[PDB]
Amino acid sequence: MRECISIHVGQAGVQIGNACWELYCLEHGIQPDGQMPSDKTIGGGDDSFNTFFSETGAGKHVPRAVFVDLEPTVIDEVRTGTYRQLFHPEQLITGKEDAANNYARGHYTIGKEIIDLVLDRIRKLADQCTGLQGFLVFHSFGGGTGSGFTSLLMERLSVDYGKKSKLEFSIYPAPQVSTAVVEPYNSILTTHTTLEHSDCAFMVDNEAIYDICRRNLDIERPTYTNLNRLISQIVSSITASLRFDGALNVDLTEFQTNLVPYPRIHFPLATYAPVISAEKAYHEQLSVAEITNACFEPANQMVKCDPRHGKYMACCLLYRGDVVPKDVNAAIATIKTKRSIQFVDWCPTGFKVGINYQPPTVVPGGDLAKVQRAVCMLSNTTAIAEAWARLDHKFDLMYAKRAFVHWYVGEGMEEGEFSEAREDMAALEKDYEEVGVDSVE
Amino acid sequence: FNSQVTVAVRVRPFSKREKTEKASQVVFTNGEEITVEHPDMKQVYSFIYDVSFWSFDECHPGYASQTTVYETLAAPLLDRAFEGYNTCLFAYGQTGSGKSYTMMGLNEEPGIIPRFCEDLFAQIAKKQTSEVSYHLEMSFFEVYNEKIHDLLVCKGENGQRKQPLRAREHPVSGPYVEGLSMNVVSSYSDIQSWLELGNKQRATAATGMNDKSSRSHSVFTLVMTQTKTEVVEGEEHDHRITSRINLVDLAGSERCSTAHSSGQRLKEGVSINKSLLTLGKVISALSEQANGKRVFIPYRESTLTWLLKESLGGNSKTAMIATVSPAASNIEETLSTLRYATQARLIVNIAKVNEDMNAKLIRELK
Amino acid sequence: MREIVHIQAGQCGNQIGAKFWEVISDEHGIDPTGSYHGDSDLQLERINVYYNEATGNKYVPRAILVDLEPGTMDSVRSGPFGQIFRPDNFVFGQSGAGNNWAKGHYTEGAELVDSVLDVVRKESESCDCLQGFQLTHSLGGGTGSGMGTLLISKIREEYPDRIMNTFSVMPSPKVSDTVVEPYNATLSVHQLVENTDETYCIDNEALYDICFRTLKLTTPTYGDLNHLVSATMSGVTTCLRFPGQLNADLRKLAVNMVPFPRLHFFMPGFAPLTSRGSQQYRALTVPELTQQMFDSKNMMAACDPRHGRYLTVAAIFRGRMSMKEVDEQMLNVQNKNSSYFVEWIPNNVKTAVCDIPPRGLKMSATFIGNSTAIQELFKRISEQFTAMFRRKAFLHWYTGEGMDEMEFTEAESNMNDLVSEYQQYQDAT
Ligand SMILES: CC(=O)O[C@H]1C(=O)[C@@]2(C)[C@H]([C@H](OC(=O)c3ccccc3)[C@]3(O)C[C@H](OC(=O)[C@H](O)[C@@H](NC(=O)c4ccccc4)c4ccccc4)C(C)=C1C3(C)C)[C@]1(OC(C)=O)CO[C@@H]1C[C@@H]2O
Ligand SMILES: Nc1nc2c(ncn2[C@@H]2O[C@H](COP(=O)(O)OP(=O)(O)OP(=O)(O)O)[C@@H](O)[C@H]2O)c(=O)[nH]1
Ligand SMILES: Nc1ncnc2c1ncn2[C@@H]1O[C@H](COP(=O)(O)OP(=O)(O)NP(=O)(O)O)[C@@H](O)[C@H]1O
Ligand SMILES: Nc1nc2c(ncn2[C@@H]2O[C@H](COP(=O)(O)OP(=O)(O)O)[C@@H](O)[C@H]2O)c(=O)[nH]1
Ligand SMILES: [Mg+2]
Ligand SMILES: [Mg+2]
């Protein structure tokens, strides 16, 4: 069997973890109490899989996961909420204080006194992983914790284990929308480090998912309690292959390599088919061909990045429900047939595929309507660098006057560290230029 | 005299530490021009300075001892002091870069500070005449966690004898320390004894980067007044000049990732980095000012800058000395240091001589 | 949990404290006796933020009172909520300073500050995780200022890692209370800027116009103005005690608001107010709140932004809201009114949201701003100062207590410098 470790660090992750684990139960027919009256009904099946959940002789089941956010006010909601009787209570409410958007705190000063636990529960959880192991981490770039603690953590994990899949899911800081004014300092510092230990980090954004939440979901006033569910389903649509059967399954490690040409471009995007409200549950057939067009629609991308200002290095597509490979070859054919899409000359192959029979599910009280099938896309593209360009510009503008710097230094971060991380990011920016330029002879 | 600051540089060589953990060379001196090779061998940065020395090796031209460096850098400031100009020299750079080894040096190869001091005493000996009477005083103090302490005080006997002082701003002469026990100099011997006491009591400590680190900032002030005859048939010795010399030994970044430490250690390191950052901002705005830019100078964001205001700018003939390493282990630090310095050349202040013809009519006749 | 020590010093502060706890008690289901009679655990999950507990399920606040030179002492105690306060925390002396700062810093407060400081140490040690301090006072006066800055400094030395916040009624441009406010305050500012992480600059005049026009009250009192000050004091820390989609705390407020360590003075605001009639004549929306929030007439500091620009703000909302509309609305403001904002700060605003509204409102918000307009107040105090200083107009009263000209001079240089610093970034580039 295969297993994986879901970690949530900071606010954003945890709000997503609540969303994520809420879905998994439903997909597995498990009740909040860890029990299976559905198994009382069925009396069989491994639906409470070892992949994400453990089990006991009481009929309880426990997810393979953990969280920490240095904000007791968040977890406590969970600890008193509907799922308190589910999780292992040893959740790391260490929030004597928060990092307050300061990397130096969450990374160095007060990431101390905490991490030695975070690693330990991981081991206890790891020791039960008589299967594959690949990690799933949820953080937000720009936030103090989601960048500070995450950077510290993965560094050690690459040393405790190293030889493992360590895939992040994370919200990039938007170009315009922001809930803070020092995310840029915080983000760049992050990529200085996690670039090196990690192996992939799917990036998303709130602005786009907001826009999607408007246009197709027909929502006037969306909020966090809906975005997370879109972010959740993806993570399921990824991880399903480990759980159910499929005419064409896939491992985590397969994503590690087919999407990752060189060690330093392991930073792709994602889409889905959340284009379906209850009313427009009709008026469409929602085919394989139908959606596969939609996956590469600029609008339905999950970050603010025109593909058309760049090219596609590699893409992977994971389908669900009643989906036939024949259609996939057909729809994917047409996608190659269009010139709005520009690939490299490197990749005649271009595309990887994946299919699982197990359809999606739908959360009650939610938004997305039932659909007999669905698909996820990932893409490593040169286009993203414009987003990198926006950030490094912001960094330089204000850093020049050394604004907000004394706070980090007040926590022990040397000055030029910022410049060290900057020079790195320009290299990454150059790296994307390199790959993007066509070859000649 | 709207005039610039002399910026000098000294690449010290590598050490036992690099011998144990091999760290290649990347700094290279084209006689005096500084060039640094990225370990990636993707870029060579290069920097030009008014002065250079190549202490990396003793042999190739460009080499200079403490006193060669003196007569390059600090003896001219001695000259301007006897001309009557206030003067400054301050050090910059990381830990283990010989910043003290240069300014102060040790017993066997003392620094620019003691070289200048004996040169100053004997230079007064050159004119120990009734033509001009001379009177020299000096103070010596330290900065630790933004707290000011007196190096020339024999502490009392107690568990806590690090008596703090505080700063006050004379509306005219600027900042100064209360209780600062400025004492009279008869000679360089007296200077030496004072310096020995102070450097002994300085809050310094061993660590993982060096056996003994300057964990506090040190200031060494001299002021020489010289009363000369005026050009009148009456009271002739009614002219005087003063000259204030300021020699400063700062601290290094001491990045905690290598300077793994805890408690008071990390506290001192934090305060140090904060101070040096503030200084850097001061330096930068000063450069912009020298470019003609109308700019607010946060002298007041700390103590070091506040006290050194009239030296970092103001009215004085000044200089900086930057210490840098050859080991690629700290190439980032050396580059930061070199960039600090090469920016630093661009700085100017307006330097004159402190006659202080107050209640004299001399300046008015002039 | 994060814990705060609240301190009261001066006629103006203690009443603000007096009105303050009356609001917090209402926000936590507590009676004048200190018992619980609420209906939600939320009012108790984080009660230890402000209060300590006692034996019979009573709850004592972490309040301290230091200028109870007795004339206001009875005023507090013989009040609707006087009795909850720890009697031992009623520290005081006698022979009031007569608004002479030096008496309030050097002579009398010197004798008393030990005792109040000792009590602070107790409330500190009894905490599990101390975060920062919360002082109420006023400038211009003797006690609130001198004894304040004294007590502020000492605490900073003892807890330099910690936070020190104040909410300080500032002297007016026009309508004075005492005649030596330029003297009393500038001394304060000298010690305030250097020993503080942030302070909230409040002016009486703005509060008057605010209550006069928007609240449409023809007979407002000191009792009612405060009722607005206590609100902001509570909104700043709503995300501390209560949860939300996006949490905030004092430390998270500064680091996003304090780019340079000296520019830590602020212009708060609070929504919504409607004089009861128009309540039937609107509806509460996010753009609606935002509209009042950046209203040039809802600024309790009396420093018209429109002659200056903002460095950074914090718009703490409170209630059930959608974040899209929130983040969108700040952007619009950044867009349309961009000239009032800095270029070299790419985003000139942060946000924070708590999912628990107040007693009788569906949604509320709190404003925090850092702007260049604060220059103007600072010039006034300086200009008023010099006109008196050069003639030594009232000087002899302080010198009788041991101050000297340098000290008055020192602060002046410092205050002018703060101005120039703001003026540095005042021009668009
Ligand atoms: C009770 C009611 O349904 O009527 C409203 C009301 O008429 C209005 C106008 C209230 C009312 O405001 C005033 O009357 C007022 C008068 C002088 C000075 C300051 C306020 C109200 O008093 C204010 C009061 O608000 C609260 O209840 C909150 O607790 C508020 N503080 C208090 O009012 C309060 C004071 C003492 C004891 C208990 C509560 C608050 C402020 C900050 C943080 C938490 C709570 C509310 C809804 C109303 C009344 C009562 C009429 C308004 O204020 C608030 C906070 O609601 C004024 O504009 C708003 C809109 C409200 O609709
Ligand atoms: N999409 C989404 N984003 C969130 C959610 N919660 C927080 N965020 C993001 O998190 C960022 C704020 O910084 P965070 O990283 O959350 O801060 P933290 O993780 O609590 O740790 P601190 O930075 O110390 O607060 C913002 O950019 C938010 O968009 C959520 O539920 N959904
Ligand atoms: N160029 C050089 N040639 C020969 N010896 C040197 C040179 N530079 C430094 N040294 C010696 O090597 C040692 C390392 O210098 P060190 O004094 O630790 O730097 P530092 O000035 O103390 N930095 P800090 O402690 O941060 O102020 C000193 O004790 C010097 O004697
Ligand atoms: N908002 C408010 N301000 C007050 C109140 N009482 C006094 N003040 C202000 O506080 C100032 C008086 O200073 P005060 O602190 O009494 O002087 P001290 O106590 O002797 O230092 C005056 O400027 C008043 O306007 C009040 O109840 N509410
Ligand atoms: Mg957090
Ligand atoms: Mg040294």
Numbering used by the authors:
A (entry chain A): 1 to 441
B (entry chain K): 0, 391 to 755
C (entry chain B): 1 to 429
Quoted passage from the original study:
The longer K772 construct includes a full neck-linker and the first coiled coil domain CC1. The faster migration of K772 is consistent with this construct forming dimers in solution, as expected from the presence of a coiled coil domain. The other four datasets correspond to KIF14 dimers forming a two-heads-bound intermediate with each of the two heads in a distinct conformation (MT-K755-ANP, MT-K755-AAF, MT-K772-ANP, and MT-K772-AAF). Different from the Apo and ADP states in the AMP-PNP and ADP-AlFx states, the MT-K755 and MT-K772 helically averaged cryo-EM maps show a density connecting the motor domains along a protofilament. This density can be well-fitted with the undocked neck-linker of a motor domain positioned further toward the microtubule plus end (leading head) and part of the coiled coil domain connecting with a docked neck-linker of a motor domain positioned more toward the microtubule minus end (trailing head). The neck-linkers connecting density and the combined densities in the motor domain in the helically averaged cryo-EM maps strongly suggests that the KIF14 dimer in the AMP-PNP and ADP-AlFx states binds to the microtubule in a two-heads-bound configuration with leading and trailing heads in distinct conformations. The new maps with separated densities identify the leading head with the undocked backward pointing neck-linker as the one in the open conformation and the trailing head with a docked neck-linker as the one in the closed conformation. The MT-K755-ANP and MT-K772-ANP have AMP-PNP-associated densities in both the leading and trailing heads. On the other hand, in the leading head of the two-head-bound structure, the neck-linker is pulled backwards (toward the microtubule minus end) forming a β-sheet with KL2 and in addition KH6 partially unwinds. On the other hand, in the trailing head of the two-heads-bound structures, the neck-liker is partially unzipped as it separates from the core motor domain disrupting the interactions with KH7.
KIF14 is a microtubule-based motor protein with essential roles during cell division. KIF14 belongs to the kinesin-3 family of motor proteins. As all kinesins, KIF14 possesses a highly conserved catalytic motor or head domain that contains nucleotide and microtubule binding sites, and where ATP hydrolysis is coupled to the generation of mechanical work. Here we report the near-atomic resolution structures of twenty KIF14-microtubule complexes corresponding to five distinct KIF14 constructs in four nucleotide conditions mimicking four key steps of the ATP hydrolysis cycle.
